[PDB]
Structure formats: structure tokens, C-alpha cells
Design a protein around this ligand. Structure first.
Ligand SMILES: Nc1nc2c(ncn2[C@@H]2O[C@H](COP(=O)(O)OP(=O)(O)NP(=O)(O)O)[C@@H](O)[C@H]2O)c(=O)[nH]1
Ligand SMILES: Nc1nc2c(ncn2[C@@H]2O[C@H](COP(=O)(O)OP(=O)(O)NP(=O)(O)O)[C@@H](O)[C@H]2O)c(=O)[nH]1
Ligand SMILES: Nc1nc2c(ncn2[C@@H]2O[C@H](COP(=O)(O)OP(=O)(O)NP(=O)(O)O)[C@@H](O)[C@H]2O)c(=O)[nH]1
Ligand SMILES: Nc1nc2c(ncn2[C@@H]2O[C@H](COP(=O)(O)OP(=O)(O)NP(=O)(O)O)[C@@H](O)[C@H]2O)c(=O)[nH]1
Ligand SMILES: [Mg+2]
Ligand SMILES: [Mg+2]
Ligand SMILES: [Mg+2]
Ligand SMILES: [Mg+2]
Lengths: 177, 177, 177, 177
């Protein structure tokens, strides 16, 4: 069944997203989530829903940890959602995005890359658009510099406090089935 | 006990309607519903509610599939709700509506025919009214051409994102008890 | 423990009130409630809540049914909530209110009489006030004519679609503890 | 694991806060909470949340009751949340706040003192600010008079009817981990 990864720096909102979208958590409650220290493999198995697996990662996985066979993980992955906290400085997020998608694409160029520009409830509508544009351009420029123009990133403006996170996650799922 | 069918093209919103109205699903969650591949017979049995059965059909049932005795099904049916996605082109929906209600009426002319012009949260109020008028007129004209003027269609403007789907489904139930 | 009765004509909203306030029912779902045909004794027993019993009656109890010892019921009752559908004609409701409270007061003049002018979500704010005034004056005039000036009615404007039903029911409970 | 106390006069909203934030209670339902007569020790233990213990106290603990070793309790306490009903007169609340934090600080000067100026949904925004200022100044002046300038109070404007209670409680938790 399709496997979707949730990756991104600590505090970007990965666990909140899976809890709100798939486990009926109120967004307000997500403030009390513990920081994630083990990969959590969430089987969306209910007989009425599309069936797929979501892997909620600890933020900022260490690609040098020999416990983690990232190549094997990526070869079995249909989509990688990279979550960026739009309310915070995102230069490190952009660096880690690049490292992550370049490693994934090299082993599975059929993977879909989905960038959630997240926590946008804290931004004005115009600033959401400017933030997406800056992220889009910087991320694509980094890809171009590395000879990875053919690696396509899709961008989404998301918040757990409205419909947008559900719409975004649904678009990601629908591409895989 | 009364039997109500949910029919309509794939993606019209049948399963969403039954989940939101009768199973406490958030409308946002319905984005992740699987396409329905078997008739689901939902017994509304709770001791505090009106008791009736809802049959959630796969979209666009094949009237030529010999596994399905539609005449027998219709003879035991009190109401047929035909769901139309108002945000999409509805010419095929209108064709299939006509085929469906004409077949049902021929075996059970006491059946109530209930047309949910659905997903109206994506329409302006004026466009909702124009869409209902166009559907109403086209559907009635098709009935007239087939000599089925006495077959009455009732029309409802519905969305899972507000009270309207509950109000509509309640009106359908109340007519049967 | 305190006993509170819910009485009123059929369809006034008695069962909706108890379901929404004490059983987490969405107001939208109450459209599908069956008409009540037996007294339902609801023990509010949760260890965190005030403990009391709510008796949800069939609408328009028959005072002439010899199965029902209304005097005994009233002698054990702390408050009687009489629910009136504000969206409907309320002349019969006023007649039945009078009959009900006069019978109750005669056996238990310590009972509290609480009139919920209900379903006010369908009224303008000014019309809510005029409706309460008309009900208040008519009900008190009927009491005066019967020599029951000392029987006090309290009036509340309520809806299951907002905080008002909770506020009203809380006021009734607080008077008893 | 961190221990957080909820203290404050009766009816200030302590139990409502813990129920709404940590037990999915609707704010409307909190109207029916019983007055608390025993300390309730609530272990926030879910494997996805920060793990800590909340002690919901009866309002206005009696420091002279020999059943209660307040010094021992305070020595094991990371934060003390003192809840003040902003809609009510708060002179007694301020007196009891002072007594409480001075006793706590004397045995555990590392404790965090968190004052929730609560029920602010009943105040205008400007009156919220003036109420916080008056409470802040009066509380600090009392500390200064007692030679307790180094005892720091943090102030929060909270309501169970919006995000503010969640935000406030989250800030308190985050300071402890
Ligand atoms: N304003 C706002 N805050 C959000 C949003 N999504 C998550 N948060 C907040 O962001 C914080 C961190 O969320 P969390 O899901 O734990 O992040 P994470 O990416 O799983 N962290 P880790 O990698 O350490 O496990 C929480 O306080 C949460 O409520 C959002 O859309 N808007
Ligand atoms: N905007 C909007 N979308 C809706 C509404 N009702 C359903 N949807 C969406 O329509 C899509 C299809 O819904 P679904 O209930 O699976 O349709 P179905 O008619 O059961 N399909 P099938 O016949 O294949 O089983 C979902 O993404 C769902 O969220 C509505 O009122 N508004
Ligand atoms: N608009 C609106 N409708 C309401 C309100 N309360 C209840 N209703 C509706 O009124 C109808 C009847 O409700 P119900 O609770 O069954 O009434 P009842 O007084 O228990 N009837 P019976 O005496 O026959 O058992 C339902 O369709 C319900 O949704 C309200 O505050 N506003
Ligand atoms: N308007 C409003 N009312 C609130 C708020 N928080 C609590 N309340 C109300 O305040 C009342 C008392 O709440 P409760 O939680 O029992 O208070 P407590 O401090 O635990 N009392 P005790 O010390 O006796 O146990 C309830 O009616 C509750 O609904 C709030 O933010 N706003
Ligand atoms: Mg996490
Ligand atoms: Mg379906
Ligand atoms: Mg009833
Ligand atoms: Mg309490």
C-alpha cells in the first residue's frame, strides 16, 4: 500500500498534521504533543478510507546515523511531504529540504515531493503568497545548481487550524492512487 | 423499516453524506473516503433515532450487471436520493438520473424521488438557484418526453459543510414515517 | 438526588435538549430523533458533574391515563421545565402549561417552574423579546384567573444551536443544589 | 515527571480548565461540573503527549487543615497556576494569591508562578488589559511589601471559550521541560 513520509525540522508540525488529519485531534490539543523520538508508522487501515501508511519522523533525521537505511526507506516511498514552519526562519529548512529530496530522488526518481509551507494561520494572505514564492524560487534554484532541474517540487500553504491541511494531504494521497 | 437508497455518479458525495449525517464524520475527513465498491447497508438502529436503512451504492451502478436485481431492490425502497455534484458538469448526471428514476418508478410508483444538488458550498447563492432551476427544468423535460409527467422529483441544495445536508436528509426521512 | 422533568408538547424539543446538553449530540443530529413514547429517566451520574436525574417525557402526557401517578411524580420533583416551540403557534402550549403547573403546584408548591421558550434560533432578537413578553403575560394572567398568583414561572430564551440551552439548564440545576 | 497545581478560589474555573484542555470537554458542558472536594491527580500519560501530572485542588484550600502537608506538596511542584475569575471581584483572590505563593516560594523558590486571569470572554479587550494591569500591580506591590520582590509572577489572559487557555497552559508546560 502507498507509503507517505512526513519529514521536516523539529517543531515544524509533522505530528500535529497526522493527529489532526487522521486521528481527530483538535488543533488546540497539538500544543501538548511530545517531540517525536522514534519513527511512528501509522497505518490508515479503516475499511472506509483509502488505505496507506504514514511515517511520522523525528525532526531533522540524521542521515549519518548507521541505524537508518534511508535508501531502502526511499525506494519503498510514494511521496515525501517536507513540512516547513512558515512563521520561523526557513533557511535551515531549505538546506535540509534540498539534502533530503536530492537523496530521495537519486534512489527513487518516481517519488512525489510535496512541500507544506505550514502554520500559515500566523501570516497575512499576501505574506503567504510572498513566502511561497521565496521558498519556491530558492528551492528550485538550489535544485538547478545541483543539476536536479527534473526533480519537481509541489508547494502547498497549510494550517491545522483550517481546511487547508486536509485539502493538501488529500491532494498528495490522490496522486498515489 | 423504511429503506432509502443513495445513488449518483462516482464522486458525487454519497458516502460523505451518510458518514457526516449518521456517523459523526467531520466533513474535512471525507476527503479520504475510498471509492465504494460494494453496496453498504447501513442500519440506523440506535434506540433514540428513527429507525431506517440506508443503502450507500457504488457510483453509477451497472443496470446490465446480472448480479443485481434492481427491480426487487426498488420494490422494497421508500425513497431514492440521487446525488449530483453541482460543481461539476451534470449532463451525465441528468442522463443517469432519468434512467434510474424511470426504472424505479415503473416498478414502484409510490417511491419518493429526492434529488440532492450537492457540494453547493462551492457556489454563490445566485448560482445555486440557477443550477437548481436548470437541473429541475431539464429533468422534468426529460420526464415529460418519456410520458412520465406524473413522476415527481423533489430538489434540495446540499453541502456536508453546513446544516443543509442534515435538513435535506431529515425531510426525506420524515416523508416516510 | 434532584429530579428535573422535561415536559411540553410533541416536537417542542425536549429530547434534543437532553441529548445536546448531556450526551454530546450535535444539534444537527437531533433532526433524526424518534418521538418519545416512554418516560426516559436519565441519571446524570458522572463523578465530575452535579448528580441529578432528568425525566424526558413523551410530549403531551395524558393526565387521564391511569398508568401514571402524576401526583407521586410531582411530589418527588424539584423542577419542572416546560418547553415551548417559539417558532410554532403556542396557544395549546400555553393551555397545557397552565394545566401542568397548576397540578404540580397543588401537590408540591416548593417545585420550581422553568419555561424554556425554545427554538429561538428561528427568531429575530426583537421577536424573541416580544414572544417572551406575550408568553409571560398570558401565562401569568391565566395563573391570576385561577387564584395562583403565588405560583412563580421563570422564563428562558433557548436554542440547541448556541450556548443558551446550556446556560438555561445550568440555571435550573443551580437553583436545586 | 513535572507536577503542576491548579489553585484558586471556588468557582474560578480550575476544573473547567483541566477538563477542556486535557479531556475534550466542551466549554458549554463545564457549567455542570461539581464543586471539587478532593484533590484530583490527573496523570497526563498518553504516549503522544508531554507527560506531567496536574493536581486540581478544591477551591480555597485550608492551610490550617492538618491533613495537608502543603510544604511537602510544594517541594515536589514545578509550577503553580493560580486561577482568578476576572468577571468577579478579585480582592479576596489577590489576598489568597499572596498567601499561596509566599508559602510556596519559601519552600521551593525554583517554582514557577503562573497567574491565569480567567473567564475573559466576559470582558472587552481594553478591560482585559486594565484588569491584568491592576492585578499585576497589586500582586507585585503585595510581594514588595513582604520583601518578596524576587518572587516572579507571570500573567495570562485566559478563557475556556477560545484558544487562550490552551496557549497559556502550553506556555506553563514548556517552561518545565
Ligand atoms: N500556529 C500553528 N501551530 C501549529 C501548526 N501545526 C502545528 N503547530 C504547533 O507546532 C508545534 C510543534 O508541533 P509538532 O507536531 O510536535 O511538531 P513536529 O514537527 O512533530 N516536532 P518533532 O520533529 O520534534 O517531533 C505545536 O505547538 C503545534 O501546536 C499550525 O498549522 N499552526
Ligand atoms: N466541497 C464539497 N466536497 C464534498 C461534499 N460532499 C462530498 N465531498 C467530497 O467529494 C469527494 C467524493 O466523496 P465520496 O463521498 O467518496 O463520493 P461517492 O459518491 O461516495 N463516490 P463513489 O460512488 O465512488 O463511492 C470527497 O473528496 C468528498 O470530501 C460537499 O458537500 N462539498
Ligand atoms: N431550530 C431548532 N430546532 C430544534 C431545536 N430543538 C429541537 N429542535 C428540533 O425539533 C424537532 C423535535 O425535537 P425532539 O427533541 O424530538 O422533540 P420532543 O419534544 O422530544 N418530541 P416528543 O415529545 O414527540 O418526544 C427536531 O427536528 C429537532 O432537531 C432548537 O433549539 N432549534
Ligand atoms: N464565562 C466563563 N465561564 C467559565 C470559564 N471557565 C469556567 N467557567 C465557569 O465557571 C464555573 C465554575 O467552574 P469550575 O471549573 O467548577 O470551577 P472550580 O474552580 O473548579 N470550582 P471548585 O474550586 O469549587 O472546584 C462553571 O460554571 C464554568 O462553566 C471561562 O473561561 N469563562
Ligand atoms: Mg513530531
Ligand atoms: Mg462512496
Ligand atoms: Mg422526545
Ligand atoms: Mg473544581
Amino acid at each position: 500500500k502507498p507509503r507517505i513520509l512526513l519529514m521536516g525540522l523539529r517543531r515544524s508540525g509533522k505530528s500535529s498534521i497526522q493527529k489532526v488529519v487522521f486521528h481527530k485531534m483538535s488543533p488546540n490539543e497539538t500544543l501538548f504533543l511530545e517531540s517525536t523520538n522514534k519513527i511512528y508508522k501509522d497505518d490508515i487501515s479503516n475499511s472506509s478510507f483509502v488505505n496507506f501508511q504514514i511515517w511520522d519522523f523525528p525532526g531533522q533525521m540524521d542521515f549519518f546515523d548507521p541505524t537508518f537505511d534511508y535508501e531502502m526507506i526511499f525506494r519503498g516511498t510514494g511521496a515525501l511531504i517536507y513540512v516547513i514552519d512558515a512563521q520561523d526562519d526557513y533557511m535551515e529548512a531549505l538546506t535540509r529540504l534540498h539534502i533530503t529530496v536530492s537523496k530521495a530522488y537519486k534512489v527513487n526518481p518516481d517519488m512525489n515531493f510535496e512541500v507544506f509551507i505550514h502554520k500559515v494561520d500566523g501570516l497575512s494572505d499576501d505574506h503567504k503568497i510572498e513566502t511561497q514564492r521565496d521558498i519556491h524560487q530558492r528551492a528550485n534554484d538550489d535544485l538547478a545548481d545541483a543539476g536536479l532541474e527534473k526533480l519537481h517540487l509541489s508547494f502547498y500553504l497549510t494550517s491545522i487550524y483550517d481546511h487547508s491541511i486536509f485539502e493538501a494531504f488529500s491532494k498528495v494521497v490522490q496522486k498515489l492512487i
